[PDB]
Amino acid sequence: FVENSKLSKQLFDLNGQAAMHDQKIGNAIRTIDTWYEDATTPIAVEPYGSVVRNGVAYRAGNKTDLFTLMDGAVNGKSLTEEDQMFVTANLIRGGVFGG
Amino acid sequence: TGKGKTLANLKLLQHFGNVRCSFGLGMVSLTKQTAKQFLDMGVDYNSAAMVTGFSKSRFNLGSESLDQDEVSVEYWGQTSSLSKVFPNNNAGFKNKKLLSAPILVTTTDHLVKASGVKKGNKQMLPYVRCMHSDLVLDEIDDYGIEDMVVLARLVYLTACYGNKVIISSATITPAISNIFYEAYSS
Amino acid sequence: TTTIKDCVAVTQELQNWETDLSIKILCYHSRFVGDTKAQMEEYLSKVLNRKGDEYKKFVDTTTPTAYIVVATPVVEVGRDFDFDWAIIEPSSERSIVQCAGRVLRHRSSTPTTHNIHILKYPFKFYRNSNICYDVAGYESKGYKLKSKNMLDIYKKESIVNSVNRLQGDAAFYTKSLTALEHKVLLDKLTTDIADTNVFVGGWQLTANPHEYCKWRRGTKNEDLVLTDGKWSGNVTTTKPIQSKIWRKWQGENGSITVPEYLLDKTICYNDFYGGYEN
Amino acid sequence: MRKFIIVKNVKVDGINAKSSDITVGMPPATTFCGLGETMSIKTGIVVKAVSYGSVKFEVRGSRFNTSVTKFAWQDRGNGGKANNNSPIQPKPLADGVFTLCFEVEWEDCAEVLVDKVTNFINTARIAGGTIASFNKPFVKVAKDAEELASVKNAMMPCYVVVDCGVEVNIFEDAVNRKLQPMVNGYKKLEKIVDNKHMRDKFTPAYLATPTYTMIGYKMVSNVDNFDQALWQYGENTKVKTIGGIYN
DNA sequence: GGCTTTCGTCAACCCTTTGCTTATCTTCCCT
DNA sequence: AGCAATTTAAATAGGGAAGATAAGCAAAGGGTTGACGAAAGCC
RNA sequence: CUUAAAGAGUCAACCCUUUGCUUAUCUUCCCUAUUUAAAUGUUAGCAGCCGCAUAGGCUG
């Protein structure tokens, strides 16, 4: 990401050598979420099923985001294996889940 | 404006007889305009002398033969008898046009040095010019305040030898008209 | 307008001004090279001549067009110009009367509503609110207007002629432009001898009236000279906005007169508008 | 046609800051008018008005209390008590760098006028304070009003005193309109019948209570009319500006 | 007959914690 | 032994995450700055 | 002759200690730098040999 750089597109140049970000790779590890509502393709494991590119969050407003399933599991609501696997996948992804 | 002020000034000068005047005007181009009016109405270069002391390189293009414009610096004129008392027979072209002109259509800075100078003998030529010639200052309101002060000094010096001052300004302020009258009265 | 950078500010605003009107902009100040300046003069004298319809052939009058000339006080002195209308930045009342004399100078048709729109403030108000009319005006440090609002110091609707300058008023000079003008004129060109005055006596013997009363007292004024396209000093030719320029004459020789204050920075000479601060 | 002589950067220390009972700080225009008439007496150059500005001024003390002066046992007959500390009467002290501009009328060269003002100032005392330093005074003339402003701007940098007048009284408007009060003169209460303990025995003497006007500090260039900063002795046993009330 | 020294006489609070203003600058013009 | 050319255009947009806390002590002194009135030796 | 005239504020010092700002992030797509042209300015001031010459001449 650049702003004032007098150059339109930079590249991640680890010591000159062309490289790609670890977050790019780690996002591609966690592109396993095929368990949302309109499940046609795997999306990146996110607390909201959110993608910047498509401009939509596949798990927002329809009670399958990570926070409601986490609250549910904690309380006692039996999480379905896919929902359980999604919550576990977000836990090994990481992130602040408080508020 | 547009009523022919400078032509009326020449008419007023010629009402008293033959004309001997210094048309001191601001700007080079306004002196060029008054010279062109003087040329096309009745005045030749044996009586008129347009003086702009910078030798500007503004030439007329298109057709030199079909111009009928661009009043120039020749002054066939008549050399006055005062040139023999000036240094080295006055000078070349410029001071001969200054001193010996019956009608001197000039930029005004060739006349305001008559009132005096810091260093040198640059006072004598406009002094002896304004001694025997009338003074015609047109649109004196466009000058600065110190410029108008030294112009009224020139008016006082011109009136010191009986010559006639023609001021031609439409937007005159009583103050200006008054102090120019008081300079002429002194 | 009043000064050169004011003129290029009005020009650069009007060139970038989005409107349905076909604005065609000229710059007409005094800081210009020998060639360029002279060319502007001859063109303007032959297009603003309205005693006949010979100008219809020097401009494109077929298409409805706004031919706008942004100028400094070089237009209000010695110019036989005839504009349809003028917008005046206020500096002095004799400037108002002279730029009224540049509108309908050759015609005799009376205007119906209004042919002059006077600006509310000079542009030096945003730079110096203490004194703003001193540039090309008789306001100064000794003669300060109490208010700079032209509703306070001028009539809102007024037939501008020589009458306000011809009358002469010394009272209320701190809140009207005309009485400010008359005040200065009687307080500098007075019937005294002083030292820089007009009745000077006793001092003609001295060098004082030629030192403290300097004819054409200007600023230092050094001359940056253009020699065959190559400038001399710190000039740096630039490129104008090319939005609405109607006429632009090029120059190769000549000289520009730059004050020593603006010699510090580059005067940045340009083909369209001469000198500015950039 | 007006003539002025300006003494710029008059560093004075030990100024008696007690302008009156209720004013402590900058010396009022009665002090500088008294300085002007003092030179009218010693040097003979008769002074109409004085325009004074403050370059720097600090009252000695804190922001709420002035530093009192350790008094010396100088009265007669209190020996024996001289070993103890002398009792302190209230006289605040201050330092001040001033710029003075005297309206004078002179008929000789400017060099002897500058020399006379310098010889006065070398023996002068601004508000009870020793004049520590001062620049060489320079003469400037106000032929017209633009020349009056030239003299005005020649005192740069200084904060001159402009009179803003009394509406109701001093305390009220000092809070309301926030202007500064100072002694513009005095009010005579009683004729003094005992001239034995005075400076002159023939000069008539009156007990006085200081009248005050309300004033503002404006930089000399921001003052429109220089007559509103030139204080002079008015004929109401007070001092006043030539330009009257600053508006 | 003042006159100068030293000792005795008479008191009693409710304080608050920076701005005041805020600096002396270029158009014409021709040489 | 100086000569080194000109114009033309420099990217639109979408985002700059909230949730937590921000210590409690104990100190902060007074020492001089009194003028009238009244006894009371003393020139 | 400016609330004029006049005046020593001195001294002294232990701010202590303590500490988890952690957490997870897709910058990304897009595309014509195009076309010219004398390097001139003598462009070199040399190689032998005639000589005491680093004086002066000759040879191509």
Residue pair C241/C16 in contact (Cβ under 8 Å)? The answer is: yes
C76, D153, D222 from D138: Cα distances, Å: 42, 13, 22
Q: Determine phi and psi for C166, rounding to 5 degrees.
A: -75, -30
Helix ranges (DSSP H) in C123-267? 150-153, 163-167, 177-188, 208-211
Whether residue B177 lies within 8 A of chain C, CB to CB, comes out as: no
Residue pair D162/D229 in contact (Cβ under 8 Å)? The answer is: yes
Residue pair B55/B68 in contact (Cβ under 8 Å)? The answer is: no
Q: Which of B63, B11, B78, B2 is nearest to B33 (CA)?
A: B2
Parallel, antiparallel or unpaired: strands D2-16 and D93-104:
antiparallel
Query: Residue type at B71?
Result: V
D211: β partners = D185
User: Which sign does the torsion angle of CA C184, C185, C186, C191 carry?
Assistant: positive
Give the burial class of C111: count Cβ atoms within 10 A of its Cβ; 0-12 exposed, 13-18 middle, 19 or more buried.
exposed
Who among C105, C168, C184 is closest to B2 (CB)?
Answer: C105
Please tell me the distance from the alpha carbon of residue B170 to that of residue B140, in angstroms, as a whole number.
Answer: 10
Closest residue by C-alpha to C1' distance, nucleotide F13: A53
Please tell me the distance from the alpha carbon of residue C254 to that of residue C220, in angstroms, as a whole number.
Answer: 19
Please tell me the distance from the alpha carbon of residue C98 to that of residue C162, in angstroms, as a whole number.
Answer: 9
Q: Determine phi and psi for C91, rounding to 5 degrees.
A: -125, -40
Inter-chain CB proximity C143 and D147 less than 8 Å: no
DSSP state of D137: P
A79, B105, B134, C253 from C226: Cα distances, Å: 85, 31, 41, 5
Give the burial class of C258: count Cβ atoms within 10 A of its Cβ; 0-12 exposed, 13-18 middle, 19 or more buried.
buried
Please tell me the distance from the alpha carbon of residue D243 to that of residue D235, in angstroms, as a whole number.
Answer: 15
Q: C266 CA to G55 C1', in Å? A: 61
C38, C42, C122, C246, C270 from C249: Cα distances, Å: 10, 11, 29, 10, 11
Q: Which of D51, D75, D62 is nearest to D2 (CA)?
A: D51
Structure tokens at C270: 């340009």
D3-23 exposure pattern, b = at least 16 Cβ within 10 A, e = fewer: bbbbbbebbbbbbbbbbbeeb
Closest residue by C-alpha to C1' distance, nucleotide G10: D70
Query: 3-class DSSP state for residue A83?
Result: helix
Instruction: Please list every residue in chain C whose beta carbon sits closer than 8 Å to the beta carbon of residue B118.
Output: 207, 210-211
Please tell me the distance from the alpha carbon of residue B27 to that of residue B108, in angstroms, as a whole number.
Answer: 8
* Interface residue ranges in chain C relative to chain D, Cβ cutoff 8 Å: 130, 140-144, 146, 187-188, 192, 194-196
Please tell me the distance from the alpha carbon of residue C116 to that of residue C84, in angstroms, as a whole number.
Answer: 9
Residue pair C148/C176 in contact (Cβ under 8 Å)? The answer is: no
**Distance between first and last Cα of chain D:** 25
DSSP state of B115: G
Who among C141, C188, C195 is closest to D153 (CB)?
Answer: C141
Structure tokens at B39: 């040329």
Residue linked to tokens 């900063």:
D229
Nucleotide with the nearest C1' to D126 CA: G2
- Angle at CA of residue C119, ends C118 and C123, nearest 5°: 140
Residue pair C55/C47 in contact (Cβ under 8 Å)? The answer is: yes
Please name the residues in contact with B49: beta carbons below 8 A apart, sequence gap of 6 or more: B75, B77, B97, B98, B100, B101, B102, B103, B104, B105, B106
Report the gap between the CA of C144 and the closest CA in chain D (Å): 7
Name the helix (H) or strand (E) containing D100. strand D93-104
The count of CB pairs under 8 A between chains B and C is 107
Inter-chain CB proximity C187 and D144 less than 8 Å: yes
Please tell me the distance from the alpha carbon of residue D8 to that of residue D56, in angstroms, as a whole number.
Answer: 12
Please tell me the distance from the alpha carbon of residue D239 to that of residue D247, in angstroms, as a whole number.
Answer: 18
Please name the residues in contact with D57: beta carbons below 8 A apart, sequence gap of 6 or more: D25, D26, D94, D95, D96, D97, D98
Inter-chain CB proximity D143 and C195 less than 8 Å: yes
| Way it was determined | cryo-EM
For residue C244, the Cα-to-chain-centroid distance in whole angstroms is 21
Report the gap between the CA of D72 and the closest CA in chain C (Å): 52
Rounded to the nearest 10 degrees, what angle do helices C177-188 and B145-159 cross at?
50
Query: Residue type at C169?
Result: D
Name the helix (H) or strand (E) containing C255. strand C255-258
Residues 80-119 of B with CB under 7 A from strand E: 107, 109-110
Please tell me the distance from the alpha carbon of residue D224 to that of residue D183, in angstroms, as a whole number.
Answer: 23
C191, C258, D153 from C32: Cα distances, Å: 40, 10, 35
Residue linked to tokens 């330092």:
D95
Query: 3-class DSSP state for residue D115?
Result: helix
Please tell me the distance from the alpha carbon of residue D29 to that of residue D182, in angstroms, as a whole number.
Answer: 8
Query: 3-class DSSP state for residue C199?
Result: coil
Please tell me the distance from the alpha carbon of residue D218 to that of residue C83, in angstroms, as a whole number.
Answer: 46
Q: D218 CA to G52 C1', in Å? A: 98
* A37 CB-side CA count, 13 A: 13
User: Which sign does the torsion angle of CA C200, C203, C205, C208 carry?
Assistant: negative
D240: β partners = D232
DSSP state of A43: B
Residue linked to tokens 């005075």:
D198
Who among C186, C210, C211 is closest to B175 (CB)?
Answer: C186
Q: Where are the beta strands (DSSP E) in chain D?
A: 2-16, 47-59, 93-104, 125-126, 129-133, 138-142, 159-163, 180-191, 206-219, 231-234, 238-241
Rg, C-alpha atoms of chain C = 21
Q: Which of D96, D100, D46 is nearest to D229 (CA)?
A: D100
D104: β partners = D47
The 3 state secondary structure assigned to D223-236 is CCCHHHCCEEEECC
Residue pair A48/A90 in contact (Cβ under 8 Å)? The answer is: no
For residue C184, the Cα-to-chain-centroid distance in whole angstroms is 20
Residue linked to tokens 């006949």:
C52
Q: How long is chain D? A: 247
Resolution, angstroms, 1 dp: 3.8
